[model samples]
Target chain A: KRVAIFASGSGTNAEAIIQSQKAGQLPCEVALLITDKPGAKVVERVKVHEIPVCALDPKTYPSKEAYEIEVVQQLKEKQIDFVVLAGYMRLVGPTLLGAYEGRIVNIHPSLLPAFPGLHAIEQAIRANVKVTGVTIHYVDEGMDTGPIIAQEAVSIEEEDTLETLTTKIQAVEHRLYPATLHKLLSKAENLYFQS
Target chain B: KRVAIFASGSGTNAEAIIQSQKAGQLPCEVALLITDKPGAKVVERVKVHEIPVCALDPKTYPSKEAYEIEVVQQLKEKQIDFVVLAGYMRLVGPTLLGAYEGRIVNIHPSLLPAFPGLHAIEQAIRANVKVTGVTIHYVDEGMDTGPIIAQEAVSIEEEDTLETLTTKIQAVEHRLYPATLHKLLSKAENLYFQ
Candidate 1:
């Protein structure tokens, strides 16, 4: 199954996916990298790997719906079977969510059923929660209310600040995301028929 | 100086601190283990090391503030020169914050200036930011907006959910927090006070 990655920021996660694939950890090939922001670092990173890159201008489309339609059309043209939301800030609109459904997956930093919105680590620290970790789930229409796939619990250090916790979470993300993707893609060809 | 750890969840971090001290990487000693939740697995783990464990009921106190005061008194009575908030969930009230001041430290799972509240990993994932990591810092009256002491950056993975990211952060926290505490404690003891 072909995979497409969507990212906006530094694209470190995208880089990690690329590295993991090169390292033979992931079974699927990264077919394309798409970015909403023009001249994003993710685009640059993809180019460095000699992968195809596409930038969709939100302004070019008449509305958000139009832009999402174009994005869906582009994915279909590429024969993309799976979409990975790697640092893509824009919410997955109904167009993409309905089109992909289980085919689309996302990684959120906080354990689901808690801190569903933004600033989860800060919320945990502020609330003084004893333990907090990462959650990987299938993206649904609702915000972060996805089906649980995998989770790893990380303890909050007594002296932990937001920066420290985030750092640790990122490290975990690097390893976990690639591993999870590898597992998902390995069975994707058979899995799609089951779905 | 002697220090005590208060944890409510897993004791992996506490183990790291103890091991670091034993290996001569840290100067302070783990004096005691305190938990609000009695019979927590962490308390059991500490008992394996033959460390004294104390449990106090937060509900028994009239207010959270009163409970914190009792905690502070108990910690001070133990001659705890420093307190580490290793996974202690209860909000340390002003009474404890005032007593500990710079002596109190906490480790958070998010990169500072980013997700500053609970479920930071979830926030990062939801935000879809590329980079997030761990922070070691001083705890203050406000939430996690304290002066950062040390930070390690981790890259977000495409498949990273809150659970996966948490495992990575915890590994780093196991190493970073104790190491920082040792450095700070050594620096403090080297100076001669007037």
Candidate 2:
């Protein structure tokens, strides 16, 4: 199977999946990395691994749907069967989610049903809870509200500043994302159902 | 007020309180560090800070009570008003706990009422839970059953090996232990309640 990874920020999670695939642990091939920001750090990370990257600006398009239309075209040309969102900042619109349906997966830092939208680590810290965790799930129209595949809790420490918490959350994301993807793709029947 | 710190492993938490006291953040003085293991890494850390450390082996004494009796005597002689347990492995016997009573505080890696005893981080990992945290509380007779003073969670990551988890837990303990001690010692009446 061939899959495309979407990321916006540092792309550490994207890099993780790439490395895992390189080690022959992941079941599919990483077709390419798609990013909205052309000069994002993710570009550098993918380039280091010699993975193809598609950098496009969503603003250049007439609308978000148009931008997603181009994204779908790119995936089709590359024979991308699956979409993986690591840290892709922009939400997936109907044009993209409709194309992949249950084939698209995402990794969110917070344990979902809790700190969803953005700044999840900061929200967890502000709430002063004793626990926050990572979640891997299928993406839908809603924000982080999809079919949950896996989740692991991360405890909050008394001395956790925002920086420390981010580090810990990212650490979980790096490992869990690749492992979950491997698990999901390993089972071929889960890829499609409405056929 | 003067305080004594107790540890059985690396003295990162002990060093934290000492450094905080040195920086004038803590209200009390770190008079000494007491450890059951004579050659533990905590001794080196306390020595580098130039604080006095009392290393006494419990096996040298006839019983656990005797060991604590000597410990109490040492604290009394040093005019220590408070006791701080950083990573002290042994449970506090009646002799020392009685002498300090509510004046003694401890920092445990896992959140209280969860994984209370040794290998707490490992326990959390084995349970496959998402969250684990630090707890600061008064030292009571039971293991980590004391009244909690403060607590904060430390999230466990999926990639965390045992070593990485230990590092994160220690970081929290270092910062939380000293800060909690400051808050506890700042109030005069909390030190001695009926």
Candidate 3:
């Protein structure tokens, strides 16, 4: 099976997924890295892995539908079997959502439905939550509102480390993002081929 | 104690809270109906309750912080003790967040932290989320990312009536948001004396 990584800003998660795919840890190969930011650093980060990158800036297109038309075109050409939204900021619109349907999955910063939107880790800090972590789920045209596939809970403390902020929210997104996908796509592989 | 109803679009939830407040079901008086849109239906809805309304457009300000600065000014001028966001579209900005922090709470359609933010019911519909309900939580800088104070779950499927959908969703928010605040403030009152 083939997979694509969709991200916007920092490429750490995308890069981690690429590493996992190449190391034979994930079920599928990382065929492409997709972004909507023209000057985003993900382009260079993916290039370091020799992975293909696609940019579809919303500024260039007249509408979201127009931009996603090109996304569908590229994904089809590359035979992308599934999509993993790493840090793509915009919510999936109806047209692209209809095209992908159940084939899309997402990685989020908190063990949702705990913290469902942006700046989740900070919110957890504000709430004094002892443990906050990541959730892998199927995407359903919603902002991290899909059915949960797998979850990893990380303990929080006065001192912790994981890149961004040494823990803006990591120790998980990179290490587990791939493992969850490997498990998810591996499960999807069996379900698809066996069925 | 006093409160403000922050709403946008239609004012069903705002009106419901106002109704609950006026009927002596709440501890706080609904002092003001505040919105970002000047001529929203919520403006008219709150007028029926005779609650004063205020408008602060996000577009008019340079930043979310700038807009929220004015919100904080108005909220304090009216001595708003807490905020009840009914259908307020904008996320809690840091300016209002700093001023209100734990004082601001919101009512959302989905039982969070599940489907949150705008168009939650639609998201649940698309996700095939079998049961959906209400969540009232403390407001934070992020959307719906606050410590959960109260919740009431309701079963809803594709075929549910639109009228009842609106009716029952209002039923839960009106009952839940106020009763929870009453409980929260009730605790605060006890804490102060003790």
True contacts kept of each: 0.00, 0.16, 0.16
Task: Mark the regions of model 3 whose C-alpha exceeds 4 Å error after superposition.
Answer: A159-168, A187-189, A192-195, B1-194
How far does residue A28 in candidate 3 sit from its true spot (Å)? 1.4
lDDT of 3 by residue, B45-120 (tens): 8877677888877888898778888888888898887788888887887788888777788778876666777778
CAPRI category for model 1: incorrect
My TM-score estimates for the predictions, one after another, are: 0.53, 0.53, 0.50
Which candidate achieves the best lDDT against the true structure?
A: 2
Model 1 C-alpha lDDT per residue in residues A50-155, reported as the tens digit of each score: 8777899787889889999989898988888788887766677899888899988887776556566777788877756545677777888888766666666677
Show where candidate 1 strays beyond 4 Å: A1-56, A73-80, A84-89, A105-138, A142-183, A187-189, A193-195, B2-60, B67-80, B85-89, B106-137, B142-180, B187-194
Candidate 3 chain B: worst-modelled 10 consecutive residues by lDDT: B185-194
Model 3: TM-score, first chain = 0.87
Residue-wise C-alpha lDDT for candidate 3, range A113-174, written one tens digit per residue: 77778877776666655456677788886688778776665655547433443354566788
Q: Between 1 and 3, whose DockQ is larger?
A: 3
For each candidate in the order shown, give its overall lDDT on alpha carbons: 0.78, 0.81, 0.75
Once superposed on the true structure, which residue ranges of model 2 sit more than 4 Å away at CA? A1-195, B187-194
Between candidates 1 and 3, which one is better according to TM-score? 1
Model 1 quality (TM-score):
0.53
- For residues A1-195, write the lDDT of model 2, one tens digit per residue: 778999888778888998899888888888888888778788988887777889889999999999999999999889888889888778889999898887888888876566788888887677655577788888889888677778777777778888988898888888888887777777565553222
